[PDB]
Amino acid sequence: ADQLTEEQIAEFKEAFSLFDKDGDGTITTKELGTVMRSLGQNPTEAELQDMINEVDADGNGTIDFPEFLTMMARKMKDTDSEEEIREAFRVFDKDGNGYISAAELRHVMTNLGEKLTDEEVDEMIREADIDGDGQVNYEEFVQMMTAK
Amino acid sequence: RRESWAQSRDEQNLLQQKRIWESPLLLAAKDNDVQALNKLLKYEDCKVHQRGAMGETALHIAALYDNLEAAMVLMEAAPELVFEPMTSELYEGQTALHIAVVNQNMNLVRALLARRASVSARATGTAFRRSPRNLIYFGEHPLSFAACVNSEEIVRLLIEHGADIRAQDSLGNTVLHILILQPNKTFACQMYNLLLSYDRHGDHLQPLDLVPNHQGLTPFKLAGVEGNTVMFQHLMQKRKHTQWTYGPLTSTLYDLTEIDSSGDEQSLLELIITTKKREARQILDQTPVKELVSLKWKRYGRPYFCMLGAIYLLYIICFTMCCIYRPLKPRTNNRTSPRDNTLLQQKLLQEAYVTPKDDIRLVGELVTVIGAIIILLVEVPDIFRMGVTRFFGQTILGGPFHVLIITYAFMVLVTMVMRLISASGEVVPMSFALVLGWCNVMYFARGFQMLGPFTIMIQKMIFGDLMRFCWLMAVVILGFASAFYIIFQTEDPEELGHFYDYPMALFSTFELFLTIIDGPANYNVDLPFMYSITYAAFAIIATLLMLNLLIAMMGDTHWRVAHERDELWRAQIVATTVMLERKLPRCLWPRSGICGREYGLGDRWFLRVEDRQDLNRQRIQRYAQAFHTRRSTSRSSANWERLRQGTLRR
Amino acid sequence: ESWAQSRDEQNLLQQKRIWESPLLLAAKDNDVQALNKLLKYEDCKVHQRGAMGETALHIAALYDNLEAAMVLMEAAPELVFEPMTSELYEGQTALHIAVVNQNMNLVRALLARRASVSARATGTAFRRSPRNLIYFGEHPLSFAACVNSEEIVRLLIEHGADIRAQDSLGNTVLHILILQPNKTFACQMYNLLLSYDRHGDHLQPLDLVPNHQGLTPFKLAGVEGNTVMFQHLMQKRKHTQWTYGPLTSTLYDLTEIDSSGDEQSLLELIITTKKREARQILDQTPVKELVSLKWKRYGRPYFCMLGAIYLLYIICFTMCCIYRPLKPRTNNRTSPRDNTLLQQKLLQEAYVTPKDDIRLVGELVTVIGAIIILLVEVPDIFRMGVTRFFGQTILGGPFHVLIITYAFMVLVTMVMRLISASGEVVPMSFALVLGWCNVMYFARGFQMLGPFTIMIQKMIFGDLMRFCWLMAVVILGFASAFYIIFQTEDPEELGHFYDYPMALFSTFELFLTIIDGPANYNVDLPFMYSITYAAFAIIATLLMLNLLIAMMGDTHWRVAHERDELWRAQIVATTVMLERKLPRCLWPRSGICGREYGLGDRWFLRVEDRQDLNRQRIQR
Amino acid sequence: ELFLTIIDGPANYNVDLPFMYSITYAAFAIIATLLMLNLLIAMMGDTHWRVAHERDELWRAQIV
Ligand SMILES: CC(C)CCC[C@@H](C)[C@H]1CC[C@H]2[C@@H]3CC=C4C[C@@H](OC(=O)CCC(=O)O)CC[C@]4(C)[C@H]3CC[C@]12C
Ligand SMILES: CC(C)CCC[C@@H](C)[C@H]1CC[C@H]2[C@@H]3CC=C4C[C@@H](OC(=O)CCC(=O)O)CC[C@]4(C)[C@H]3CC[C@]12C
Ligand SMILES: CC(C)CCC[C@@H](C)[C@H]1CC[C@H]2[C@@H]3CC=C4C[C@@H](OC(=O)CCC(=O)O)CC[C@]4(C)[C@H]3CC[C@]12C
Ligand SMILES: CC(C)CCC[C@@H](C)[C@H]1CC[C@H]2[C@@H]3CC=C4C[C@@H](OC(=O)CCC(=O)O)CC[C@]4(C)[C@H]3CC[C@]12C
Ligand SMILES: CC(C)CCC[C@@H](C)[C@H]1CC[C@H]2[C@@H]3CC=C4C[C@@H](OC(=O)CCC(=O)O)CC[C@]4(C)[C@H]3CC[C@]12C
Ligand SMILES: CC(C)CCC[C@@H](C)[C@H]1CC[C@H]2[C@@H]3CC=C4C[C@@H](O)CC[C@]4(C)[C@H]3CC[C@]12C
Ligand SMILES: CC(C)CCC[C@@H](C)[C@H]1CC[C@H]2[C@@H]3CC=C4C[C@@H](O)CC[C@]4(C)[C@H]3CC[C@]12C
Ligand SMILES: [Ca+2]
Ligand SMILES: [Ca+2]
Ligand SMILES: [Ca+2]
Ligand SMILES: [Ca+2]
Ligand SMILES: [Ca+2]
Ligand SMILES: [Ca+2]
What we know:
This is part of a larger assembly, with one copy of chain A (148 residues) and three copies of chain B. Chain A is an all-alpha fold.
C-alpha cells in the first residue's frame, strides 16, 4: 500500500495464513465466521455479510491478499521506528521472512562471544514475545531495542 | 589474466563520462538544459545519432540521469530515438525504455510506449548475466525489469501495451524464474501472484509455472535449489488439499508429485543434496519435506542401513583373519645383513596352500577379493563416467567416505597381484587395507543419533583446527630436529640413540612433541651442555604452549559449531535415504505415501499430515477487531541490554 | 609523584590567597556592597599576585561572577589587557576564562573594551598530555569551538579573530576539533569554521595545511582513531558518477590514502601508531577495497614468491649444517672416567674433497644471505632504534628481532670457522631454531594460518610469561627439596638428583611430566620422598598444568574477535612494506590515473554497489 | 595403551624396526593423543556448562 516495507507484509501474510482455513487465498464469509465464533462472540450471518462487502473492491465476496493488504492500511497500526533498527533486523534475519528464530539468536550471540546455553535463548524470547508464538516479530523487536 | 576484467569495466565508465563533457548535446542532456536543447537541435551538423563510449544517444542520458523535461524535447526532434540499442561488449540491447523502467518510476515509460516502443528488446550483454560479476540480475525483456524492481504500477502498464509474459532468456529462465532468485523475497511473492493473474489460462501446454529452463527445472524446484525458504512456503500452498478441521486439529494432504523421489526424473530431494549454497539445506526443515524424510527413514531407511552395516562388518572380520593367519616361513640364509640392524626372522611363502588350514583361508581370501570388485562396480562407474581426475571435481571434494572405500578396494587388488606374481612387500598394502578397512565402520555411524553428530565433528577438525596446527608443528619439528641432531652428531649413539640419523631425528622429535615417548636422559654420562638448554626450550613451546593451545582451539570451535552439526547430521540422513532408495530395487522399497487410484484423486501420490494447530486468542483478536466494522527474567533482560548497546554502537 | 604534589599544594595556595584578601574574597562571591567600599581607597595594589598570577577580574571570571566583573572594568587599568604572569596558568587572559565558562555576557563586555583576541595561552596546563585533562587549544577561537559555543565563534570572527592560528605543536583550529572526545558535536563545529574560511590567499587552505610534524586534518582523523570525523571528511573527496536503480557508482579520490612514492601517507600512519581505535579506519569504504586490491593482485603473489626464496634459503643453510666436517677424537677417552661419551671432534681446516667443494657453495650462499638481512634491517634501526629505542620494535613486532638474530648467529659461526674456534654447536643451535621459526612470519598471507600465529604470540607474552613465574617458584623449592633427600644416597640407582644443576632439570621435566619419575622398586627409598613427591604430583600435574589449559582455553574464546582484526592489520603492514622496498617497474600504482580521462591529475578508484531496494522505500 | 599414553611407545634403538611401522605409528600418533583425545576434552568441556542448570536441580532430587 505504497509505503509497506518487507516486514509488515511478512507479518500480514502469516496473519492471513492462520485466519484462512482452506489453504487458498480466498476468505469466504463462512470461514470468517469460523474465527469469530472462536473469539466467544457470535455472528448474525448479516454481520459477516457486512464485514466482507465493506472492502471487496473487485466484487467477488472472497477477500484476496491484495484486498486484504490494503485493508490493513485502512486499519493501520502505526509507522514509527528508526532507520538503524530496521537495518539491524535484516542483518539478524537470515532467511528474509520477517521473523527471528531460536537458531537465529544463537547465531547472533555466538558472533558476540557471550557463551549462551539453549535454555536462556528460549528465556530471551519469553520476554520478547507478545502474542505468544515463540517467534519475535518486527514490532516485538522494536519494542525491545529501545523500550522494555 | 582475469583481473584485467575489473579494470576494463572501470575504463569504460570513465570513458563514458569523458564523452559527455566533450559534446554539446550530451552535456545538455546530463543536466536539464531545456534552453540549450532547443538551441542546438535547430542546427544541421548536430549528429543526433552520436555514439558515445557505449552507444548512448541523448535520450539515454536524459533517462539515466532521469531528465523528463529534456526527454520531451528529444522525442519531438528525433524520430528513431526509441530504437537504436547500444553496441559495446558491455550493455547491449538496452533501449531508453529499459532505463525508464529500472528507475522504479518515470513518466517517460508512458511516453515511450506511445512513441511505438519495442518490448521484445533482448538486453543481452556482459552486464545482464548472473555470475560472480555484476551486482544485479534483472532479466532480459522489459517486463522482467519491471517485475524485479517492485513496480506494481508499471507491470500493469506494460501488459496493456502488448507485452510478452512468457518469453525466456539466454539461460532459459522465464519471468517467474527471475522473481525467485532476487534478494528481496517477500516483495517477490506479491509480484509472483500478479504475474500469474495476467496469464488468463493460456493454452500454452503447462501454463508458465511448470515450464523449465535450459537446465530443466521448474519454478517450484528453483526455490529449493537456490535456498528460497520464503518462496517455497508460498509455492506449497497450491499443493496442499486440506481435508477437515475438527476444532483445534487440522488434516492437510500434500502433493508428493515433485517432492518425493520419482523415477528417472531427478526429484527435488536429489537436487538439494547435490548442491552447494548452505541455505538449500533449510528446505529440509519444511512441513512436507521434514515429514517425508522421517517416514522414509524410520520405516525403510534405518533397517536396511543396519543390514548393510552388519554385512560390511562381517566382511572386515573375514578380511582381518586372512591377514592374521597369512603365510609366513622362517628365515633362510643366516642373518646375512650385519648385527644390530637386522631382527626379522620370518619371511613370506612363495606359494603354499597345501594343508587343510590354508583351504579354510582360501575360502576366506576369495570372499574379500570378490567383495573388493563389487565395491569397484557400484562407485567406480561414477568415476568411469564423471571424469577420472580432471573432469572429476565433484565427488572427491564432496564425500570423504567415497575416497576411503575406493582406496580399500584398490589395496586388496594390489595384494591380489603380489600374491600371484610372488612379490616381497606385501606387509605394506595390508597395512593400508586394515586401517582403511576398519575406519569405514565410521561410515555406518550416522543412523545412530548418539554417534551421528560425533563423526561430523571429526571431519571438521581434520579439515579445520588440525591442519591449522600441522603446519606450525612441522615448522617446529624441522627446526628442533635439526638442532637435536647436530648436537648428538658428535656423541656416542649407544646410551642415547634417539638422534643418529636425520630420518630418525625427525621421528624422535615428533614423538617428544606429542610426549608419546619419555625423553633423552642418561643419568650416567654427563650430557652436552647445549642439550639441557635446547630441550628446555623445546619442552615449553611444545608441551606447555602449543599442545595446550590446540586444546583451546578444539574447545573454542566445539561450542561455536554445535548446532550446525545437528543441521549437518540430519542432512546426511537425506543423503543416505536417497542413495539407499536408488541402488536398491523397488521390490524392497515401497514408494512412500498413499496412491490416488482407488481413492479417486488421480495418479499422484499423497501424504497426510495432521497437526493440533494453536491458540493465542491475543493474536487473532488484533486482526478480527480490525475486521470488526460498522529471577531468570533478570538474567534474560540483562542479556538484552548487552545486545542493545552491542548493536546500536556498531 | 612530584607533579600531583605540586598541583595540590598550589591549587590550595591560591584559595588561601582569597581568604586573606579583601576584594578577591569579594570576587569569590558577589559581595557588591563591600566592593564599592574597597575601590575608593588610596591604592588597592591592584595586581597583588596570588599563587598562579591572577587578578581580581580573573577570579570574578572563573567563579561566574558577572555582577562584580562589570563593576571592576570602569575602575580598571590594563587588567583587561593582562595575562596571568606566572607558571602553569600562563598567558590565560580574562577573555579565555569567560569563553570556557560556556555562557557569558562578559565576553561581549570584555570585547567591548577592545580586548585581545590574540593571546597565547601557553602555560603547562594547556599542552596535550596525560597530565592535562583538556587540550582545548592555545587561542580564544581554539577554546570556543571545542566547548561547543556556537554564539561566541559567531562573535569572535566578527571582532577580528585568528582563523588559522598555528600553535606550539603547530595545530590549526581544525586540528584541535579532531582531538576532542565528543565526536558528534565536532561535526557541527567543523563546517561552521570552513564557512568563514572561503578563499582568496590560497596557501593550501585549512583542510590542507599541516602542523609542525606534517599532518592534514584528514590524516589526523586517521592517526588518532577518530572515525565519525573520518567519514565526514570522505564526503568531500567522493564523487558520485551515475545511479541506475539500486546500482550506484562512486569515484573516490585516492590522493591522501595512497602513498605516491614518498611523503608518508595514511596507510603508513595507522600501522606505526598503536591505538585500538586507530586500526578501525581499515574498515571504512575506500580503505577496505584499496587493501584488497593491493593484496589480491600484487600482494600474495609477491609474498608467496618471497616466502619460497626464504624456505629455499633455510634448507641450504640446514644441509650445510648436517654435513659439517667432523673428525674422530684424538684425546684418549680415559679423560674423566666413565662419564664422557664424546667420540668425535671438529676438523681444523680441511676442504680438499669434491664433497666439500659442493658444500663450500652452500656455506657461501648462507653467508651472503646473512649480510643482505643485515643490510635491509639494521640500516632501519640506525635511524629509529640505535641500541634501546628498538624497544618499540622489540615489543611491537618480534619478527624484526628474530631475523636479525638469525643473520647475526651465522656471522658468529662464520668467525669461529675462519679462526677455527672450539664450540661451533653453540651458535648453530641458536641459528637453526631461530631460522626455521621465521617461516611463521610467512603464515600471514593465509586465512588458514593467519589468526593462529597471533594467538601464539599472545599466549607467550600474556599467559606464559605469567605461568612461568609461579612455575619457577614451585620447581626451585621442590628441586632443592628433592636434592637434599637423595643427597645421602647412591647416585647410580635413581640418579636424578646428584648435583644441584641436574636437580633443576629433573624437576623441570617432572613438572611438565616429560619423564616418568624417580622409582627404583628394588631398593628402599627414603620415607620423606614418598610424601613430598605425592604433594609434588598434585600441585604440578593436577593443579597447575590443568589450570593453564583452563587459562589458555578461557583467553582463546575471549579475544577471538580481536585476532580477526589483528590479522587484517597485518595485511596492511605487509602491503606497505613491499610497496616501499620493491621498485616502480613492478608494483604499478593502485587506482586509475585521471589525466587521460579529462578529470585532473589525481588517482582514482571507483566502487559499484547495490543498495537493497527496501532502503529506497525508506528514502521516501 | 598407546591410545591413552599410559605406556611409552614401541621404540627399540640398536635394532632397526621395519619401514612401514614408522609411517603407521605416525598416523596413530595423530588419531590419538592429538586428535581423538583432545576432542574428548572439548566434548566433556562443552557439556559441563550446557547441563549445569540441570545437574543442580538433578542433585536436589537426590535428597528427596
Ligand atoms: C563377498 C560378500 C561378503 C559380499 C560383500 C559385499 C559387501 C560386504 C560390500 C560390497 C558393496 C559394499 C557397499 C558399496 C557401496 C557403499 C556406499 C558407500 O557410500 C559412501 O561412501 C558415501 C559417502 C558420502 O556420501 O559421503 C558406503 C559403503 C557401501 C554402503 C558399501 C558397504 C559394504 C558393501 C555392501
Ligand atoms: C601428513 C600427515 C600424516 C601428518 C603430517 C605430520 C608430519 C609433520 C609428520 C607425520 C608424518 C611424519 C613422517 C612420516 C615418515 C617418516 C619416515 C620415518 O623415518 C624412518 O624411516 C625412521 C627409521 C626407523 O623407523 O627405524 C620417520 C620420520 C618421517 C620423516 C616422519 C616425520 C614427521 C612427519 C613428517
Ligand atoms: C620466567 C623464568 C623464570 C622462566 C622459568 C624457566 C626455568 C624454570 C627453567 C627454564 C630454563 C631452565 C634451565 C635450562 C638449562 C639449564 C642448564 C642445565 O645444565 C647444567 O648446568 C648442567 C651441565 C651438564 O648437564 O653437564 C642445568 C639446569 C638449567 C640451568 C635449567 C634450570 C631451569 C630453567 C632455568
Ligand atoms: C643469499 C641469497 C639466497 C638471498 C636469499 C634471500 C633471503 C635470505 C632474504 C633476502 C631478503 C630477505 C627479506 C628482507 C626483509 C624482510 C622483512 C622482515 O620483516 C620483519 O622484520 C617482520 C615484521 C614486519 O615487517 O611486519 C621479515 C623477513 C624479510 C621478508 C626477509 C626474509 C629473508 C629474505 C627474503
Ligand atoms: C591428596 C591425598 C590426601 C590423596 C591420596 C594420598 C595418598 C595416595 C598418599 C599420601 C601419603 C602417602 C604415603 C606416605 C608415605 C609412604 C611411605 C612410602 O615409602 C616407604 O615405605 C618408605 C620406607 C621404605 O621404603 O621402607 C610408601 C608409600 C607411603 C605409605 C605413601 C603412600 C601414598 C600416600 C598414602
Ligand atoms: C635457546 C634456543 C636453543 C631456543 C629458544 C627458542 C626461543 C628463543 C625462540 C624460538 C621460538 C620463538 C617463538 C616462535 C613464535 C613466536 C610467535 C610470533 O608471533 C612472535 C615470536 C615468537 C613468540 C617467538 C619468540 C622467541 C622464541 C620462543
Ligand atoms: C599411512 C597409513 C599407514 C595409515 C594412514 C591412515 C590415514 C591416511 C587415514 C586412516 C584413518 C583416516 C581418517 C578416519 C576418519 C575420518 C573421519 C571422516 O569423517 C573424515 C575422514 C577421516 C578424518 C579419515 C582421514 C584419513 C585417515 C587419517
Ligand atoms: Ca475460504
Ligand atoms: Ca477479492
Ligand atoms: Ca527467520
Ligand atoms: Ca511474536
Ligand atoms: Ca604424558
Ligand atoms: Ca612416559
